[PDB]
Scaffold this active site. Structure first.
Site, PDB file in Angstrom:
ATOM      1  N   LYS A 108       0.847  -1.190   0.000  1.00  0.00           N
ATOM      2  CA  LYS A 108       0.000   0.000   0.000  1.00  0.00           C
ATOM      3  C   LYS A 108       0.887   1.247   0.000  1.00  0.00           C
ATOM      4  CE  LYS A 108      -3.976   1.864   2.556  1.00  0.00           C
ATOM      5  NZ  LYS A 108      -4.977   1.528   3.614  1.00  0.00           N
ATOM      6  N   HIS A 110       0.183   4.405   0.404  1.00  0.00           N
ATOM      7  CA  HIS A 110      -0.428   5.518   1.131  1.00  0.00           C
ATOM      8  C   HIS A 110      -1.020   4.972   2.429  1.00  0.00           C
ATOM      9  CE1 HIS A 110      -4.446   4.096  -0.177  1.00  0.00           C
ATOM     10  NE2 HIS A 110      -3.803   3.781  -1.286  1.00  0.00           N
TER      11      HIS A 110
HETATM   12  O1  LIG Z   1     -13.819   7.097   0.621  1.00  0.00           O
HETATM   13  P1  LIG Z   1     -12.481   6.936  -0.053  1.00  0.00           P
HETATM   14  O2  LIG Z   1     -11.825   8.239  -0.459  1.00  0.00           O
HETATM   15  O3  LIG Z   1     -12.496   5.909  -1.152  1.00  0.00           O
HETATM   16  O4  LIG Z   1     -11.463   6.345   1.048  1.00  0.00           O
HETATM   17  C1  LIG Z   1     -11.850   5.255   1.892  1.00  0.00           C
HETATM   18  C2  LIG Z   1     -11.199   3.962   1.410  1.00  0.00           C
HETATM   19  O5  LIG Z   1      -9.769   4.068   1.457  1.00  0.00           O
HETATM   20  C3  LIG Z   1      -9.198   2.925   2.097  1.00  0.00           C
HETATM   21  O6  LIG Z   1      -8.959   1.875   1.144  1.00  0.00           O
HETATM   22  P2  LIG Z   1      -7.493   1.521   0.563  1.00  0.00           P
HETATM   23  O7  LIG Z   1      -7.655   0.820  -0.766  1.00  0.00           O
HETATM   24  O8  LIG Z   1      -6.674   2.789   0.606  1.00  0.00           O
HETATM   25  O9  LIG Z   1      -6.840   0.540   1.670  1.00  0.00           O
HETATM   26  P3  LIG Z   1      -6.908  -1.068   1.882  1.00  0.00           P
HETATM   27  O10 LIG Z   1      -6.032  -1.653   0.796  1.00  0.00           O
HETATM   28  O11 LIG Z   1      -6.302  -1.178   3.256  1.00  0.00           O
HETATM   29  O12 LIG Z   1      -8.356  -1.490   1.823  1.00  0.00           O
HETATM   30  C4  LIG Z   1     -10.289   2.505   3.065  1.00  0.00           C
HETATM   31  O13 LIG Z   1     -10.156   1.132   3.430  1.00  0.00           O
HETATM   32  C5  LIG Z   1     -11.574   2.791   2.307  1.00  0.00           C
HETATM   33  O14 LIG Z   1     -11.960   1.661   1.507  1.00  0.00           O
HETATM   34  O1  LIG Z   2      -9.153   7.953   3.254  1.00  0.00           O
HETATM   35  C1  LIG Z   2      -8.357   7.054   3.606  1.00  0.00           C
HETATM   36  O2  LIG Z   2      -7.448   6.631   2.856  1.00  0.00           O
HETATM   37  C2  LIG Z   2      -8.492   6.454   4.971  1.00  0.00           C
HETATM   38  C3  LIG Z   2      -8.825   7.257   6.063  1.00  0.00           C
HETATM   39  C4  LIG Z   2      -8.936   6.652   7.313  1.00  0.00           C
HETATM   40  O3  LIG Z   2      -9.229   7.331   8.322  1.00  0.00           O
HETATM   41  N1  LIG Z   2      -8.719   5.333   7.435  1.00  0.00           N
HETATM   42  C5  LIG Z   2      -8.406   4.580   6.366  1.00  0.00           C
HETATM   43  O4  LIG Z   2      -8.211   3.353   6.517  1.00  0.00           O
HETATM   44  N2  LIG Z   2      -8.291   5.134   5.144  1.00  0.00           N
END
Ligand SMILES: O=P(O)(O)OC[C@H]1O[C@H](OP(=O)(O)OP(=O)(O)O)[C@H](O)[C@@H]1O
Ligand SMILES: O=C(O)c1cc(=O)[nH]c(=O)[nH]1
Ligand SMILES: O=P(O)(O)OC[C@H]1O[C@H](OP(=O)(O)OP(=O)(O)O)[C@H](O)[C@@H]1O
Ligand SMILES: O=C(O)c1cc(=O)[nH]c(=O)[nH]1
Ligand SMILES: [Mg+2]
Ligand SMILES: [Mg+2]
Lengths: 224, 224
Positions: A108, A110
């Site tokens: 990941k 970010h």
């Molecule tokens: O409302 P948004 O702007 O879409 O952000 C929220 C999403 O961002 C993260 O996912 P991410 O894919 O970054 O992380 P993960 O691989 O841990 O699920 C989190 O788990 C949510 O699914």
């Molecule tokens: O927007 C995100 O990437 C994010 C925010 C947060 O508070 N927690 C998370 O898992 N993702």
């Protein structure tokens, strides 16, 4: 050839929800198999709970001591979660500190970052949970992921031991599970093996699928 | 202002496992946030079980009718599994038939194939489960996956509503959850909102963290 209670229970459910299927399947290893065991069919709340119970019983039976249950992507992910929950529910006091973890396929870039979700692995005893073992590639890749995270693998558990070789060129004819066990010096547990499937379905099976099963096993079946 | 019991319990849970992190985080949306809620930190059997309880209570009290609970990769995967189990455990006869599902990031090129693990989505009513909503991109992409599979999204639930806008250019300044709910004509449930967790923490937030959160919300906070 006598099945334990929880094995009979598990196999009965595997047939019901059609997790065990006969046909023609390309395995991850590229092998053409006449049967496939898809744990994704244990997909109701009840079936997930039943699945977790099967793993938990096998884990409790082994008396293995560990800190984290790790499930590799993708099938391993829900498995780690549900079995972690189940062990804390039925473990009494032995598994009250039990943690879960799994990996992303890619780091990941970010947020919290990294490939490991759940518990941090460094300096903890890890049980690897997966659905099936065929050639053992997935478990070896899981071992490396955990080793890189500075965790210590103390065992592995799968639902189905397919009782196949790592490679047809392996001299001893040890199965993937046996090879992994000897390679890493850890117990490799399974709920059932292919032999249990064959002996359980004996009462109600062809006799035509058996031909393809036996043909497959002459190529890939372990002999040790 | 006034919390429901399941919300109080969840906030206690969040503090128990310290799911709320402070620092400098790049969110999926590319926003630079002074705080980050990591549902991966509910990482013991008990924490997972209690987390599932929080989701299940919220789902039950919404009276929403559905067939499949779908969690997008990665955080949604364990969520879909544990909440499916929990709903079958505590929800009675209305939830004895629900199934779970989740997606792989890439289609599986062998075995059972495809991107969906668990229940097939076509012709079924789907509840999307996820951890947090920020800009709403994840839920929109989950909607697209389900719609393209010919499934029917009937709602969504998240643990934390961050109470942020989809875009700083949106005219009414509705939150992402409010925007998504209106757009698809579906309920968007959240266990708690940002305001709940901030209020609950009281003096446990530092002067530095308070100032950074204020600055962030002036930019990204919803007003409706
Ligand atoms: O409302 P948004 O702007 O879409 O952000 C929220 C999403 O961002 C993260 O996912 P991410 O894919 O970054 O992380 P993960 O691989 O841990 O699920 C989190 O788990 C949510 O699914
Ligand atoms: O927007 C995100 O990437 C994010 C925010 C947060 O508070 N927690 C998370 O898992 N993702
Ligand atoms: O012993 P091996 O030869 O490695 O094969 C067994 C592995 O293959 C499958 O994973 P796969 O990545 O194919 O599917 P998934 O995406 O459903 O986890 C299965 O879940 C095992 O992890
Ligand atoms: O080897 C595989 O790819 C495999 C075999 C099997 O029976 N089930 C499964 O999910 N994968
Ligand atoms: Mg796998
Ligand atoms: Mg996510």
């Amino acid at each position: 050839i006598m099945l334990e209670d929880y094995q009979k229970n598990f196999l009965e459910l595997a047939i019901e929800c059609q997790a065990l299927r006969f046909g023609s399947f390309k395995l991850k290893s590229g092998r053409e198999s006449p049967y496939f065991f898809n744990l994704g069919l244990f997909n109701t709340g009840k079936l997930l709970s039943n699945l977790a119970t099967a793993y938990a019983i096998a884990i409790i039976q082994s008396d293995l001591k560990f800190d984290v249950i790790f499930g590799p992507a993708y099938k391993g992910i829900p498995l780690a979660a549900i079995v972690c929950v189940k062990l804390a529910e039925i473990g009494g006091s032995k598994f009250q500190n039990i943690q879960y973890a799994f990996n992303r396929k890619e780091a990941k870039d970010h947020g919290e970052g990294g490939i490991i979700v759940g518990s941090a692995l460094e300096n903890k005893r890890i049980l690897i949970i997966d659905d099936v073992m065929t050639a053992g590639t997935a478990i070896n890749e899981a071992f490396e992921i955990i080793s890189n995270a500075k965790g210590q693998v103390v065992g592995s558990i799968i639902a189905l031991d397919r009782q196949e070789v790592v490679s047809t060129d392996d001299k001893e004819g040890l199965s993937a599970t046996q090879t992994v066990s000897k390679k890493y010096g850890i117990p490799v547990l399974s709920i059932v093996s292919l032999i249990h499937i064959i002996t359980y379905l004996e009462g109600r099976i062809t006799a035509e699928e058996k031909s393809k099963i036996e043909q497959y096993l002459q190529t890939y079946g372990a002999s040790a």
